[PDB]
Amino acid sequence: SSVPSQKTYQGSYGFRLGFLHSGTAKSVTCTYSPALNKMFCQLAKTCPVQLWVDSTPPPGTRVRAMAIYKQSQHMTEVVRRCPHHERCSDSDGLAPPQHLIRVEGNLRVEYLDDRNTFRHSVVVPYEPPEVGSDCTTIHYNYMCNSSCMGGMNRRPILTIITLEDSSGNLLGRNSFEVCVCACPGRDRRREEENLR
Amino acid sequence: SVPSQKTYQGSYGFRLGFLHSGTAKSVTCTYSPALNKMFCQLAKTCPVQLWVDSTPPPGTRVRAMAIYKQSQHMTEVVRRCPHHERCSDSDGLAPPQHLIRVEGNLRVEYLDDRNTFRHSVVVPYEPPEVGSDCTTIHYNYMCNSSCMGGMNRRPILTIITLEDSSGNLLGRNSFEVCVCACPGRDRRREEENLR
Amino acid sequence: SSSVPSQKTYQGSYGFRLGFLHSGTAKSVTCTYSPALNKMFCQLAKTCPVQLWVDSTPPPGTRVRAMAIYKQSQHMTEVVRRCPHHERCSDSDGLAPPQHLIRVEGNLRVEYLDDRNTFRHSVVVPYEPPEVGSDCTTIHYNYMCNSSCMGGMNRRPILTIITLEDSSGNLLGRNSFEVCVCACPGRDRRREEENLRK
């Protein structure tokens, strides 16, 4: 199917993303590079993504994550787990086995296999920050490596995070590149070295 | 019930031979006598020679089958990984799940054993061409030793059996195999691991 | 294609077999047959005489079909057709479809078949008995693409299968021969003949 938009749209609520500072130890579980707008993370490890808003979205608002290929020649291809990982015994009880992106720690998560575009996405209700907190954090997990054969096969992906109303209308959108890999700190440091 | 790997030259004096192709980093197929191990690239020609002291009767068949080498893995059927089983690399004759193919023989026959679930590939035995002392079969291995969800860096043995037209055993030999990107580089590594 | 046709020699009830001319190996002779290899070496679009020999005469309605297949088992399911260039080079003889490798010359009753189910190409003419004073029936074939053509045969050897059939397509007889369509048939014949002598 045609590739969903990745255009940054803060919208009426001033929707932005934030990421924890985690450092670049060789095999740190998850690390974000501001200079690349790129997350490096290990398979099945917690990846925190922060939602920041200037004003609070309505009740019933939801937050959706979807992966797409970054490169034009691959844009029409659905991002999914490789044949091996799809057939592994790693089900969390909620996510269909073909889905790359899962959410942990939220029993209200829903998974969509779009009947029109065949793309996968994972969505949770938007909860405003608890009093004393400045942002809302969602814990994602990526369940296949960037390097997997028959899956991403070293082709870079973007994760698109959208804020939507209860009926699915777009309220806001942001995105970040992601590399799922064995050694996120090593690889972040290497990619950062390369723009020099 | 693990297939036998016991060497049996039998009445026809059946032995295997290999081409000695050296250890250039990316040589297609190379055999290590020290290890009795063939190192070869995925989908490329792997020649295996059949040598006999006397000629088996027409109707004789030659079967190849892979098993895991390590005792703890021996009962597991050797098959292509989920990625490679789904690739569009059919030659029109081989089943997509089979690790070992034979190339260049229209009489090739593949078996999924109904009882053991093991895969094998069999061709008719033919005597050497005039002036030649051996019969060469061209095998292809269709998954890397390193493939996740497949061999997963577990060593395999290929067992070559000479059979009569009804399947009775006439001879057996075997060799270890590593299917890899750089067979010359890798042959040298395993050899030095001992001495 | 999902299957492969038989290439087994079958003389049948009429004692059907093939014959070929003695043409020699003068480097660039237009067509030459190697009895040792059962292989015809010829130039693109040049006449390739093939003789049909029979012990008794098949009845009117009998047909003679020619079909190419790849010789190597790993390519045998792939339909032999002309390369993208030759398919488009506007060299029609008025009857042969542009995709067909094998043509027949000089026969107004030639028919070209593109099999709806195997997708294989073939060319067929009515069987005619030999002319007076002759022992055999000669068909003039042409091969319209080189063995070396990219996107075509791509250096893969082919076999031509000649079948004798009744009016319904039932098999009456079969024979086959290898073919290389190349620039220098004499040279290439001699080189391939040398390659056992080694």
Added chain:
Amino acid sequence: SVPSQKTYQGSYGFRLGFLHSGTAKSVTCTYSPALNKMFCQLAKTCPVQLWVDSTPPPGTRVRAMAIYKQSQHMTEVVRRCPHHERCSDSDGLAPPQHLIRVEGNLRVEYLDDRNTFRHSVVVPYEPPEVGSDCTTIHYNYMCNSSCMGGMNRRPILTIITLEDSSGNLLGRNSFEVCVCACPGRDRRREEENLRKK
């Protein structure tokens, strides 16, 4: 009707540079100054440097086009042969028929000319990166000079033009190209053949 090939530096002092990669038998891309001729392998990176004396205005673009070198063949559009046109070698951007592609530039644009039907490939001009004195474009040639039904052993020139945003000419350079299996062998041979006995 034939596009001009006449070299001229123009007001920005535009000229080309090439990597001097030598003549090892199968070097992937090499350039002969004596012949003003690039020899390169199909689909391999062919770096061409743009050198200017002063920086051209915003919106400047750089176009490449192939034409046959021989006068008898000049009016024929240079295109890929039927085989290569149909190979599964697409980069997702170049039309299947085009001989010349640009690699590693997401802003590449391709043109089939309305009047002449000739093919060209155009990129925005960018000034040299910091610490560099020239701008490099990575071309690929997607058909061999020898291809039957394509160039068929007929020599070609590549014409590189510096253009304003509207397509008006600012500068032009050209070089002969042979796309072949063994660029070093073939370059060394052609240069060996320049002299007398």
Added chain:
DNA sequence: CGGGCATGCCC
């Protein structure tokens, strides 16, 4: 990549 040789195509 590239030595060795197949294959096109002149003399």
Added chain:
DNA sequence: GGGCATGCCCG
């Protein structure tokens, strides 16, 4: 027939 130009295999 001779010789060379040019592509391709598999190390």
Added chain:
DNA sequence: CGGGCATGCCCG
């Protein structure tokens, strides 16, 4: 943890 190395694969 970082150092180190095995293994696939790609620029030239």
Added chain:
DNA sequence: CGGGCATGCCCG
């Protein structure tokens, strides 16, 4: 090729 490097994964 074959030197080099990306990437998984082991080891102390």
